[PDB]
């Protein structure tokens, strides 16, 4: 049985390996695609320049991008905080980890339960 | 997502080269991009308060206690009890419809 599941596991490793390379060829073909957007946006700029005046608000969309970036840094720092909290993780912390697992199970359980109630109401 | 979005932007930038206009899309796009970061901001602040309470305990933390287990046990008992009550409402509604 170990050899059986080993054949399955090697199949899984191979297939996920191939799928990651497919995502990578996507990440590349998409860089190529994002580049034509850049050259054509350059064309649009060199055309809109061939007009009178009056560019639009850029100092606002740039601020939106900056808000996105600051939120990204916040999420990264939250990842760091979670990593350090784990780095801090006696019978005590075992009790805490187990209680957290149990509570998470209760949460997903109530989620499935509400899903059932809503399916019934739609029923 | 990201690939096809770069694709759509490039396609719209291509059609403009001859003569076109595809702009409402990026408008809704910036709209959703802001709506996304919205919840993440509240997340940043909630994590702020979480780290705050954690370190508040950590300055107090030079000791441990045995009662929190019993407290969490009775609370999780009432909790799963409420959860099973909800699941019972769900099974009973399923049965009401499947009897209808």
């Amino acid at each position: 049985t170990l050899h059986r599941e080993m054949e399955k596991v090697k199949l899984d490793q191979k297939r996920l390996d191939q799928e990651l390379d497919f995502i990578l060829s996507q990440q590349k073909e998409l860089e190529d695609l994002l580049t034509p957007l850049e050259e054509s946006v350059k064309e649009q700029s060199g055309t809109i320049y061939l007009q009178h005046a009056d560019e639009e608000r850029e100092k606002t969309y740039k601020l939106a991008e900056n808000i996105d970036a600051q939120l990204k840094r916040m999420a990264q720092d939250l990842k760091e905080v979670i990593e350090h909290l784990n780095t801090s993780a006696n019978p005590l912390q075992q009790i805490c980890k187990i209680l957290n697992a149990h509570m998470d199970s209760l949460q997903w359980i109530d989620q499935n339960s509400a899903l059932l109630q809503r399916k019934v109401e739609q029923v | 997502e990201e690939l096809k979005n770069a694709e759509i932007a490039l396609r719209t930038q291509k059609t403009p080269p001859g003569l076109q206009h595809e702009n409402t899309a990026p408008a809704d796009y910036f709209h959703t991009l802001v709506q996304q970061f919205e919840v993440q901001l509240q997340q940043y602040r909630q994590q702020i308060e979480e780290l705050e309470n954690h370190l508040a305990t950590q300055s107090n933390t030079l000791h441990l206690s045995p009662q929190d287990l019993s407290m969490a046990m009775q609370k999780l008992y009432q909790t799963f009890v409420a959860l099973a009550a909800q699941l019972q409402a769900v099974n009973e509604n399923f049965k009401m419809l499947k009897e209808q």
Binding site: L99 | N53, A72
Partner: peptide
Amino acid sequence: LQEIQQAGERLRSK
């Protein structure tokens, strides 16, 4: 500890 902080908060809430 993040889930555990959340769950302490929740069981306290109930």
